From a paper:
Furthermore, the T. thermosaccharolyticum SPP (TtSPP) was shown to accept an even wider range of substrates than the known SPs, offering opportunities for biotechnological applications and further engineering. The IcSPP crystals contained one protein molecule in the asymmetric unit, whereas the TtSPP crystals contained two. IcSPP seems to exist as a monomer, whereas TtSPP in the crystal structure forms dimers. Thus, the dimers observed in the TtSPP crystals probably do not represent a functional state of the protein. Residues that form hydrogen bonds to the glucosyl group are highly conserved, both in sequence and in structure (Asp49, His87, Arg195, His295, Arg399 in TtSPP). The same is evidently true for the catalytic nucleophile and general acid/base at the tips of β-sheets 4 and 5 of the (β/α)8-barrel, and the aspartate that crucially stabilizes the transition state. These catalytic residues are, respectively, found at Asp197, Glu238, and Asp296 in TtSPP. One tetrahedral sulfate ion is present in subsite +1 of TtSPP. It is held by hydrogen bonds with Tyr201, Arg134, and His344. Arg134, Arg195, Tyr201, His344, Gln345, and Arg399 fulfill this role in TtSPP. In TtSPP, on the other hand, a histidine residue is present instead.
Author numbering: 7 to 345, 352 to 502
Write the structure that this text describes.
Amino acid sequence: HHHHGMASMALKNKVQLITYPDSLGGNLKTLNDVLEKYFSDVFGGVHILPPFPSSGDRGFAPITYSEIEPKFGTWYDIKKMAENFDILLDLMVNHVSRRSIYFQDFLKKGRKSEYADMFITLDKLWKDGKPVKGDIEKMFLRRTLPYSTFKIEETGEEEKVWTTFGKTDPSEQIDLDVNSHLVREFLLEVFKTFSNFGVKIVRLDAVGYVIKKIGTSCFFVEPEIYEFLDWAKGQAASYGIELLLEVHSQFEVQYKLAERGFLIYDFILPFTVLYTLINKSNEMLYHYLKNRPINQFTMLDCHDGIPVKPDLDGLIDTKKAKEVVDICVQRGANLSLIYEDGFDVHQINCTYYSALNCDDDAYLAARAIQFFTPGIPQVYYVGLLAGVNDFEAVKKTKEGREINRHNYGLKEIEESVQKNVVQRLLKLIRFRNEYEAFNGEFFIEDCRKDEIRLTWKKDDKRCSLFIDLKTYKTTIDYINENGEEVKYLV
């Protein structure tokens, strides 16, 4: 029922960092050093993108969760960080590396492997294990074919298993059968491992894909998906873990998840803030702020691109979606597509600072809007350092999403944090962490279309954001410790 289990939910309301384990100095030890040097009271939590040994997709093809990738560090590095920050880690509920012991044993022994049932051999979907084109055509495909062919060593036979994702063929990412008792035991063991080292929040990667059903899109298949979500939520709670679901879908799916008591990502705000600032109009933002669940993790940038379709379906027309997309692409962006007909832009791959034309004032305005929006605010490491599009990584790797995944060395971090725009952002972050009003009541204030006025109130504390969208001048009027109203020019 409504907001099930949320009576006990009380998350720390402080800004969090999103980073790769190696993108701030090269490993978890340099990450910890950088956090201690510059950011101890800047972040209340850290989402470390997948730090387990992985065979592809920069961490999202995990081989095992029982150790941290040794290039990055050890589980004790995570435990030490958890002493100072809330740690958020990924659970790849949908797939595991083909190089895991589970799948390599299966490729050796075929059906006599004790792990065979962990994987979606095609006989679980079709009587004879033969794919049917008409059925595939109904599916939401994320690669040309949603399966891969492997050779069973002991029999020499060819076997197909489901692989939703994978840039190589065969894919490195083998889908898990979440109906298998063996998979549920496997996932439970990861929760236990995570909990053992202090992890408090777990992101369910690609959770929308876990239910396969012939005749459906195989994306967020109801009601089956909710049986898995309910199971996973209760087991995670047994180990002290809250689940954060990652679902790129139409807003009705996200809203129903929140209505049913699941934490979600705010995948509408990133585009909404871009549109607000590019067009100097608060109308879309105000409509969204008045009609959205508040128990969301907010972001501008993350490790993926800025969502467009399906996340904004029914909320913006193609004209305005294309306006913002085209402007971002003129500013260096590349696009991830749904994959010939219609508007098919899935995400805008672009640093958020570059998307705003490197306009410091507009970028600080964007973060102020984010931090004044109800929800737990997350700052991606590239945006923390006001990073611009990494064209070298795009040209060298031919991977568009690497535009927003630059790896910073220590010396480059030392230089970047001294930039005026970064120092302004750090001051704003600390204000959002320190000022008590953000833990109180939220009010959307009347104002002109080219203004933004948002207020938080708690006890004698109150802070009121004002943005002039004509100039992007961003001011916060707040009550200081002596009860005096003070003006903070962001």
